[PDB]
Ligand binder design. Structure first.
Ligand code: 8K8
Length: 383
């Protein structure tokens, strides 16, 4: 009902613009008033979810009120036999059409929640960096891993989330720009995995060989190990930019349409990254094995601390070990959903997931960065 009325507005407007006498103008204008009044009571297909009195509907009916105004002016001029001014008032109708009818509810909640997770992730991890860095008594190895991890979460709130909003609004950009958007979250996630594993190793050294601990874990070795973790995170992270991507399909569909050059796409996450890289390489190699090794390490640490029971040092190491194991478990728990979504994508391309569960998985994956400082300060209050 609305579409045919719209096309009657268009065609009849062209009839007035191609008219010779005033009878054609007046008749076409009557038709346009009928169709405009009949379409003012309609609802656009885009506005299914918006309420009947929502601002979109009032702007719609308002624009149609202005429209019927212009139509009534042109008609009042056409009844007087002034075909010139009637055609002019017909020329204004295109401008009124341009300002209005030529121009997100579920999505806005996602955007806002992302902004919230940013406003919790950035200042909290900055606060951790303050508490450890500014204090001179906190220049340890585990403390250095903590500092690096807090840096990673700060960058998650400051980079991964802003780019996570710009990937959702989806602008039309080049292909490589979408990779440059996609890689930082890979890098930072791998960096967090390696940081947690390094904390586990440092705990195992503090509980198994304390007698020589401070003489085996030199601060030089702390810097070397941290730098190695960052480098691993960049190698595993910038692998898609090295050439492992779904550029073949995008470029094939780009040449099938006849166009040639740099492909331009919506910049979705799924179209620029090969799921073989996410599943086989980024996960089955650089996520799951480190998790398993951390499990074995923490089991050994708890075993040694349990068998070794002055008492205060080992009780303290037990508290720190509890906190570390808890944080690692919350990392794996907050990060496994997205990975399992990748695996379901690779293994069953036909099975399509409800969007709500994906939004939840992303809320967990990005939200853990805000979850770390809360649990950390909580465990400071415990000990
Ligand atoms: C260890 C680091 C994890 C990195 N990573 C992903 O692994 C990841 N998978 C996905 C999905 C969700 C939906 C079904 C499958 C294909 C696409 C689209 C799964 N989106 C991801 N995103 C970005 C999210 C915000 O747009 C992401 O950063």
């Amino acid at each position: 009902d609305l579409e045919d009325n719209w096309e009657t507005l268009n065609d009849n407007l062209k009839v007035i613009e191609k008219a010779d006498n005033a009878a054609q103008v007046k008749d076409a204008l009557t038709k346009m008033r009928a169709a405009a009044l009949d379409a003012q009571k309609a609802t656009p297909p885009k506005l299914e979810d918006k309420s009947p009195d929502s601002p979109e509907m009032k702007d719609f009916r308002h624009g149609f009120d202005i429209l019927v105004g212009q139509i009534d002016d042109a008609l009042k001029l056409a009844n007087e036999g002034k075909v010139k001014e009637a055609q002019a008032a017909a020329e204004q109708l295109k401008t009124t059409r341009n300002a209005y009818i030529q121009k997100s509810a579920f999505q806005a909640a996602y955007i806002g929640i992302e902004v919230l997770i940013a406003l919790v992730s950035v200042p909290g991890n900055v606060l951790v960096i303050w508490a450890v860095k500014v204090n001179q008594a906190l220049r340890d190895a585990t403390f250095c891993f903590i500092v690096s991890l807090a840096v990673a979460d700060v960058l998650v709130g400051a980079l991964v989330i802003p780019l996570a909003i710009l990937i959702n609004i989806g602008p039309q950009t080049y292909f490589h720009t979408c990779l440059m958007v996609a890689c930082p979250v890979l890098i930072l996630a791998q960096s967090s995995i390696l940081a947690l594993l390094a904390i586990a190793v440092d705990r195992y050294l503090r509980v198994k060989i304390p007698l020589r601990y401070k003489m085996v874990v030199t601060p030089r070795r702390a810097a070397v190990a941290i730098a190695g973790c960052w480098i691993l995170s960049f190698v595993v992270g910038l692998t898609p930019m090295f050439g492992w991507n779904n550029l073949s399909a995008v470029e094939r569909a780009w040449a099938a349409a006849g166009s040639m050059g740099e492909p331009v796409i919506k910049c979705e996450f799924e179209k620029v990254i090969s799921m073989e890289y996410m599943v086989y390489f980024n996960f089955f190699v650089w996520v799951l094995p480190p998790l398993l090794l951390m499990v074995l390490i923490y089991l050994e640490v708890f075993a040694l601390i349990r068998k070794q029971l002055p008492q205060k040092y080992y009780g303290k190491e037990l508290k720190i070990a509890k906190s570390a194991a808890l944080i690692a478990f919350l990392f794996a728990l907050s990060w496994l959903p997205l990975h399992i979504l990748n695996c379901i994508t690779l293994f069953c391309p036909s099975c399509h997931k409800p969007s709500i569960l994906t939004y939840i998985a992303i809320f967990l994956a990005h939200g853990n960065s805000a979850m770390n400082p809360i649990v950390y300060a909580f465990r400071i209050q415990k000990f």
